[PDB]
Design a protein around this ligand. Structure first.
Ligand code: ZN
Length: 110
């Protein structure tokens, strides 16, 4: 009950986070492109995930702990760093989002 509350609070801090420029870094990660526009993603990436899917898993009670949630958030970021070039905007945003998740988790449910 407060597990669900915690998870939404943690994921909402990640989703809503903005850099010093005002840009919402999560935008690109909310929903993957489908197989059609981007076929190359699904051939290289073995376990695709997006924040909509993570939100679905929280809502439907699929995460047993904060650790299980963290595993999916770390996968999202890892997939982004696999698909995109080191130093690209998307790669670097995923790095910051990893760290946003960890801080939010420490702040919210130490
Ligand atoms: Zn429910």
């Amino acid at each position: 009950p407060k597990l669900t509350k915690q998870m939404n609070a943690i994921i909402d801090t990640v989703i809503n986070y903005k850099d010093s420029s005002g840009r919402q870094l999560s935008e690109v990660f909310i929903q993957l492109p489908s197989r059609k526009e981007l076929p190359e993603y699904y051939e290289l990436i073995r376990k695709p995930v997006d924040f909509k899917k993570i939100k679905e898993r929280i809502r439907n009670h699929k995460y047993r702990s904060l650790g299980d949630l963290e595993k999916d958030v770390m996968l999202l970021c890892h997939n982004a760093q696999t698909f995109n070039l080191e130093g690209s905007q998307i790669y670097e945003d995923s790095i910051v989002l990893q760290s946003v998740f960890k801080s939010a988790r420490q702040k919210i449910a130490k």
